[PDB]
């Protein structure tokens, strides 16, 4: 009922990985605005049905101290039977989650109102590779590979360029397949924003990655001083470039 | 010449660890505001002389992508002979460094103007213990120890309570010495803000810490959405409490 929603199908099949991201407002007189992404989970339900169920949950958060800094404990209730496998308790980085001018007190639970929901359907979880997955594998690297993600703010007409680290390698590495994969990479609303690179061939810069995988890259750390809702509704992804730089 | 400065002597001796934190403005028409803390270094120079030298350096920063997110490469030039041992190239977390509404473009060097400088004199570096130092030592913990740092914003009359993680322990632990050390702990402008707990006796909650040490705790991660200059000039540290919580 009048919920803003987005559904992005980046995988075709009866089963997919659901990457869900909520934009919420604190239920409060002076409300914090924040975005919450749910740990990825599998579904066999049609995405156009799943998004309707996702829109119906109830969310509470509590901000806490952790060894790494402020974190948000998230609780998701009022999950229908369809969402039995949806993670219901988890923790995310509070600085990334909360909008630029939004703050929460610590150690107090606060209910949130869902204002928008995005569902992106990815390949099966075993076919997803992360940056952290590859860092473990690198030995005696000489160079960094960086993705340059370019956006245009369509309302302010500002160009945004965010470099994000992909991996390091020892030093052709820039195969045609690699260049094409970077050029055609997609940005979706998850973990703030998530860069999704399709890896078919795994020669060169894609070494150690399973064939027919999605290499997914978190942009959330670069969005601590943004409103993620604002970004996902006003930034248009216009290009992806890359750089290979000596360490 | 008319530089705002602060000097805090938390150690008496001919030699000390210098903990230096600069508040700067980008040299620019639309300037970013940010705070830069220098890796700790030893000095035998009188603090009232060192602060004058510190005020005279030239600072440049460059914002870059790293595996952990946006970082600021800092370069400190125009160091006089007195500052020979002062770190001149290092990297800090850009989200913590930059003020709430301040942003930098990536991969471009930008000169900064120093607007204020704080020097805090700590014990010798081998007598400083960090949270990370203690996390390595913990095995099968059951509880977290949290420091509750309370401030008053003297201009807005807002109370600020920031819990910060000290350590975990296996489960008396709250000795009189521990309680007194927490009650009397100091907050200084370094790493955003730094909690400094003096450890004389190391029984209980202080186990594994060298006698006659300063246990120093970073608050910077909790200040990503603040202006550190604003905080160090407008927040008054009013109390420190603690909590011991089951994990
Ligand atoms: K944010
Ligand atoms: K900050």
List all residues of chain B from 100 to 159 with a beta carbon under 8 Å from chain A: 100-103, 105-107, 131, 135, 146
Among residues A216, A159, A230, A155, which one has the least CA distance to residue A188?
Answer: A216
CB contact under 8 A, B225 and A65: no
Task: Tell me the two tokens of residue A89.
Answer: 């308790």
Instruction: Enumerate residues 6+ apart whose C-beta is below 8 A from B43.
Output: B15, B16, B17, B18, B50, B85
Q: How many CB atoms lie within 10 A of CB A211?
A: 10
Method used experimentally: X-ray
Answer positive or negative: Cα dihedral of A12, A14, A19, A25: positive
Among residues A36, A52, A25, A33, which one has the least CA distance to residue A113?
Answer: A25
Beta bridge partners of A43: A16
CA–centroid distance for A191 within its chain: 3
**Phi, psi at B188, each rounded to 5°:** -125, 160
State the distance from the centre of ligand 1 to the C-alpha of A81, rounded, in angstroms: 32
User: Among B68, B164, B225, whose Cβ lies nearest the Cβ of A221?
Assistant: B68
The per-residue b/e assignment along A13-38, b for 16 or more CB within 10 angstroms, e otherwise, is eeebbbbbbbbbbbeeeeebbbbbbb
Task: Tell me the two tokens of residue A88.
Answer: 């219901």
What dotted CATH number matches A1-123?
A: 2.70.20.30
Nearest CA in chain A to B245: A65
State the distance from the centre of ligand 1 to the C-alpha of B114, rounded, in angstroms: 28
Identify all chain A residues contacting B105, using CB atoms and an 8 Å cutoff: 161
CB contact under 8 A, A106 and B68: no
User: Among B70, B161, B222, whose Cβ lies nearest the Cβ of A222?
Assistant: B70
The 3-state secondary structure of chain A reads CCCEEEEEECCCCCCEEEEEEEEEEECCCCCCEEEEECCCEEECCCHHHHHHHHCCCEEEEEEEEECCEEEEEEEEECCCHHHCCCCCEEEEEHHHHECCCCCCCECCEEEEEEEEEEEEEECCHHHEEEHHHHHCCCCCCCEEEEEEEEEEECCCCEEEEEEEEEEEECCCCCCHHHHHHHHCCEEECCCCCEEEEEECCCCHHHCCCCCCEEEEEECHHHHCCCCHHHHHHHEEEEEEEEEEEEC
d(CA B223, CA B14) in angstroms, rounded, equals: 33
A118-A189-A4-A11 Cα dihedral, nearest 10 degrees: -40
**Region of residue A37 (left: phi > 0; alpha: psi -120 to 50; beta: else):** beta
State the distance from the centre of ligand 1 to the C-alpha of B130, rounded, in angstroms: 28
Instruction: Enumerate residues 6+ apart whose C-beta is below 8 A from A202.
Output: A208, A209, A210, A211
Structure resolution, Å: 1.9
Rounded to whole angstroms, what are the CA distances from B55 to A25, B5, B73, B129? 44, 8, 20, 28
Contacts 24+ apart (CB under 8 A), A60-63: A60/A109, A60/A110, A60/A111, A60/A112, A61/A34, A61/A36, A61/A104, A61/A109, A61/A110, A61/A112, A62/A107, A62/A108, A62/A109, A62/A110, A63/A94, A63/A104, A63/A105, A63/A106, A63/A107, A63/A108
CA distance A129 to chain B (A): 15
State the distance from the centre of ligand 1 to the C-alpha of A93, rounded, in angstroms: 9
Place of tokens 């119906």: A56
């Amino acid at each position: 009922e009048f919920m803003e929603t987005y559904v992005n199908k980046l995988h075709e099949g009866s089963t997919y990985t659901a990457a869900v991201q909520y934009n919420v407002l604190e239920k409060d007189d002076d409300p914090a605005s924040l975005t919450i992404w749910v740990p990825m989970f599998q579904s066999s339900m049609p995405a156009d049905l799943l998004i309707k169920e996702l829109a119906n949950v109830n969310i509470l958060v509590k901000q806490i101290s952790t060894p790494k800094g402020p974190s948000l404990r998230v609780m998701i209730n009022s999950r229908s039977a369809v969402l039995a496998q949806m993670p219901s308790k988890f923790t995310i980085c509070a600085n990334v989650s909360l909008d630029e001018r939004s703050k929460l007190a610590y150690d107090v639970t606060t209910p949130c109102e869902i204002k928008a929901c995005s569902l992106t359907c990815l390949k099966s979880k075993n076919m997803l590779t992360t940056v952290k997955d590859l860092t473990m594998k690198t030995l005696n690297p000489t160079h960094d590979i960086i993705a340059l993600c370019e956006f245009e703010n369509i309302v302010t007409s500002k160009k945004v360029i965010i470099p994000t680290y992909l991996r390091s390698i020892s030093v052709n590495i820039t195969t045609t397949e690699f260049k094409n994969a970077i050029t055609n990479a997609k940005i979706i609303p998850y973990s703030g924003l998530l860069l999704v690179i399709t890896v078919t061939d795994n020669k060169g810069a894609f070494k150690y990655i399973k064939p027919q995988s999605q290499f997914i890259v978190d942009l959330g750390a670069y969005l601590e001083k943004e409103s993620i809702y604002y970004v996902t509704t006003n930034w248009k992804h216009t290009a992806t470039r890359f750089a290979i730089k000596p360490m």
